[PDB]
Amino acid sequence: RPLPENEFQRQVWLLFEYPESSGPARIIAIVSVMVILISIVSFCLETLPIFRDENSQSTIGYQQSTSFTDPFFIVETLCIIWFSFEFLVRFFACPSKAGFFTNIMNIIDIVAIIPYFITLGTELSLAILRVIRLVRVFRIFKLSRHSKGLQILGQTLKASMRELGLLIFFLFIGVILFSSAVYFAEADERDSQFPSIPDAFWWAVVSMTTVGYGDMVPTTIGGKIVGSLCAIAGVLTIALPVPVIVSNFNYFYHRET
Amino acid sequence: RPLPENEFQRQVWLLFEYPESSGPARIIAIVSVMVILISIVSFCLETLPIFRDENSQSTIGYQQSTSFTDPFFIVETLCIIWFSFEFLVRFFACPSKAGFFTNIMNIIDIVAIIPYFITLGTELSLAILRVIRLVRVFRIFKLSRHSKGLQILGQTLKASMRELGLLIFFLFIGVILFSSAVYFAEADERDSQFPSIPDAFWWAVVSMTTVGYGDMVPTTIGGKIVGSLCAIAGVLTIALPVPVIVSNFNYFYHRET
Amino acid sequence: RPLPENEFQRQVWLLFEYPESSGPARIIAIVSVMVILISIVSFCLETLPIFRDENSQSTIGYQQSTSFTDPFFIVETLCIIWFSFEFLVRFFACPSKAGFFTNIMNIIDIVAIIPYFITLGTELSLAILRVIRLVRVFRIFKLSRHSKGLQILGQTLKASMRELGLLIFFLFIGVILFSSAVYFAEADERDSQFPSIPDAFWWAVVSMTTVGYGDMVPTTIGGKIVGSLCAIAGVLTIALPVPVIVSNFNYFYHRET
Amino acid sequence: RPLPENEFQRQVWLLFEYPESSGPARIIAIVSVMVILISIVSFCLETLPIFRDENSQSTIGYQQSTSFTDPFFIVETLCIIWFSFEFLVRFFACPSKAGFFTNIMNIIDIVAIIPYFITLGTELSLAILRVIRLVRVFRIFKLSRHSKGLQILGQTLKASMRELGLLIFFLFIGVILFSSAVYFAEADERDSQFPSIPDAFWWAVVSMTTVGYGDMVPTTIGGKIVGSLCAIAGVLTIALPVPVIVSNFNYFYHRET
Helix, strand or coil: CCCCCCCCHHHHHHHHHCCCCCHHHHHHHHHHHHHHHHHHHHHHHHCCHHHHCCCCCCCCCCCCCCCCCCHHHHHHHHHHHHHHHHHHHHHHCCCCCCCHHHCHHHHHHHHHHHHHHHHHHHHCCCHHHHHHHHHHHHHHHHHHHCCHHHHHHHHHHHHCHHHHHHHHHHHHHHHHHHHHHHHHHCCCCCCCCCCCHHHHHHHHHHHHCCCCCCCCCCCCHHHHHHHHHHHHHHHHHHCCCHHHHHHHHHHHHHCCC | CCCCCCCCHHHHHHHHHCHHHCHHHHHHHHHHHHHHHHHHHHHHHHCCHHHHCCCCCCCCCCCCCCCCCCHHHHHHHHHHHHHHHHHHHHHCCCCCHHHHHHCHHHHHHHHHHHHHHHHHHHHCCCHHHHHHHHHHHHHHHHHHHCCHHHHHHHHHHHHCHHHHHHHHHHHHHHHHHHHHHHHHHCCCCCCCCCCCHHHHHHHHHHHHCCCCCCCCCCCCHHHHHHHHHHHHHHHHHHCCCHHHHHHHHHHHHHCCC | CCCCCCCCHHHHHHHHHCHHHCHHHHHHHHHHHHHHHHHHHHHHHHCCHHHHCCCCCCCCCCCCCCCCCCHHHHHHHHHHHHHHHHHHHHHCCCCCCHHHHHCHHHHHHHHHHHHHHHHHHHHCCCHHHHHHHHHHHHHHHHHHHCCHHHHHHHHHHHHCHHHHHHHHHHHHHHHHHHHHHHHHHCCCCCCCCCCCHHHHHHHHHHHHCCCCCCCCCCCCHHHHHHHHHHHHHHHHHHCCCHHHHHHHHHHHHHCCC | CCCCCCCCHHHHHHHHHCHHHCHHHHHHHHHHHHHHHHHHHHHHHHCCHHHHCCCCCCCCCCCCCCCCCCHHHHHHHHHHHHHHHHHHHHHCCCCCCCCCCCCHHHHHHHHHHHHHHHHHHHHCCCHHHHHHHHHHHHHHHHHHHCCHHHHHHHHHHHHCHHHHHHHHHHHHHHHHHHHHHHHHHCCCCCCCCCCCHHHHHHHHHHHHCCCCCCCCCCCCHHHHHHHHHHHHHHHHHHCCCHHHHHHHHHHHHHCCC
């Protein structure tokens, strides 16, 4: 039960525990939010056809160079430097080092920083590279550190795991059912847009969610009846656990007041 | 209502009354769930153009043979064998089989095994083959034996028969009304995409459910006004009994907790 | 209310007003419902290209002949005869002829029976004919006499006129606003799909109701931003009075039970 | 606050502020509403190719001529004259000019009239003219002075700024997430319809709102999985703060009685 005796990490953590307490903490929070937003904007803009063409050493999406002529690389490195500085500052100033991984927002940053170390280690299947370049985008969720609403969203999704699982399960059941029905209904037609049941999965999903795309549509009377049933059942299926998820969100949203 | 008096039938009833009794029961349940999922995956994959096209012969979709060279047929036979074994095991314990079929879950399995007897009978008057090949898909509903959420869905649909019937009735009324209106609105146009009122039923259902496909759309001012009314009335009609169905689902969902 | 006191009209009123009173009344009600359904089916099937082509073919809308070889004409005449018989039978039991225009259910029947007989009478200044040809479809609402659910729908719409009018007003405001915005956003484009604001009304309606057709879509950045705002505002606008209308429907639906 | 004490401005204020006070006030209110509707109709009709071509008449929005012989320009000037007369009449009824920071009606009016003053100044370099022609559309919101329902809408939007901001934030997060996912999923295809992430923003918005256009759709298995997730998450995200906004609307709707 003895005190830590460091007298500096605890002081910094107490100072940065209430960002509204002092001006410098609010300035730092604003700088962090602006840097996150700048990183998001740069990430989105890097994929434009004007810049992407004029950028393994090619499948990784970036080429390391000392000169760093690409402005997008410079901005990415600057944002990575700021993120690393913030992570180290919070890691060296947390009084509860053993329970440092209790905050989810820290796990998000550690997950975002793992791929760089993994790449460095493995440098000395193929879907891993695609999924890792995909997982790069999730520095968006680092906005949950400053946004209270996104924290309420996270708590709602954590407390509504069973209901969301039921939603996914009901959608899956209905999708297979109606895809099978519409594939067999329009099976004896050469103009049919449903070559197979897995292909009809896409139509079943875009009809059950009532999105409606028109890329694949029924053409037979039986196919159209199955499509009508698919739309009705999709409404009836989505509407069941959404109220429970909404009640959870309302609870975690009004819990503050 | 005399008791069996055998002194062992009560023991079997007690043993089969508590599925959670032992670990081997959990293992058997897991094996059954995996077998159902494997059967669903195999059934969905059987229809891919890679296997079906590159193997009467088209009306049935499968050829029964003693050799059983097709891997999909092998998996189908294995799953059918497991289902038959489970059904026989659960049926060999019922003294009064006459009232045994009060549960819908056993009717689902007897329906899933109907295709075997139908094929046997027809091996030794056209809709029967297509309907049997389609009813082959309802082995999904045998997942309701293991899933509590799908049981709550079944209870909700049982207790919401009147409200679902009202939904269907209101949808039918609005569909005919607006299909007639949009057919007569765009009747004096040779470029119209509504050849007849039954052909406009498809547009009415995909607009009233607010799915929206674009394959058939109005082109005249009157047709567009009718389409606007169709969308508004479809929202207003779907939204009426969905809250009652949702209340029923919430009741049967919080009853278990 | 009070009984007629005539001692003979009351018997016929109880016979033709309460189907549950006696078996013959139930049979008559079933016959009436089936006749309405047959009339609806015949009306829908008459417009099919197989039959409509092979029927003053525009001013009257039907060919009168003594032989009446057309099955659709025979069915229409039989249904009209039955409707006229029912209307006369029920009108012979109404003492208050002056207050006959008070019940909306009888006004619906008289309006649905006006077209054919009034056209025949005037056969032996132009919009009236179109109005009559449109109103011929409205015998569907004669099912509200036998269906309690459609009566609850009618009561809900009658008691929710203000909120439904607010819904229409909000949709009109949003439609004009977003159609103007999307027309001016993509005004300086030759490939633009919005020639004018009234032409963009259709897109605004199908986006606000979140139906989504794709026949007319934005192509500019400003047009796409306006479309995003249109979809969001459409959800936010439809969702406001629908709960009130649903509360009214639930009240009038649980009032009977 | 305190009355002007002039004994004349009060009479005009009561005439032009309380339509229910007297018959002439109701007549004036009806005339104003009809004038706003006529102006809206004329503004919408001005953009039709029938009139706009047969009148730059598009960049400035008006035809400058000494004769001013066009009757439609006369109608527009008459509507502007009536609006100016109403504005002057109500401006002559404000006693305390120093208390400008207390009434929100004066702030709204001054903010709305500043662009009119800029237009007057510039009457006697490209985006300004387009934005002024677009801001001309906001006479639609002048109907809020007479409509109570649109006042309730305004109060609901003013009291639900936090929930609407959360809705926009969640939509933005999901849009960027799923646009990135669908761009990277369908990146290794020559026929891909997602050249870049900002281009996939439109698809993410029209899928998450469940509108569904079909102009740009996924074609790969990964793209289709991402689209399914996009639709589900869009429903789950839109449905969260809409109940709070609806509760606010219901509160401000029933607060009147």
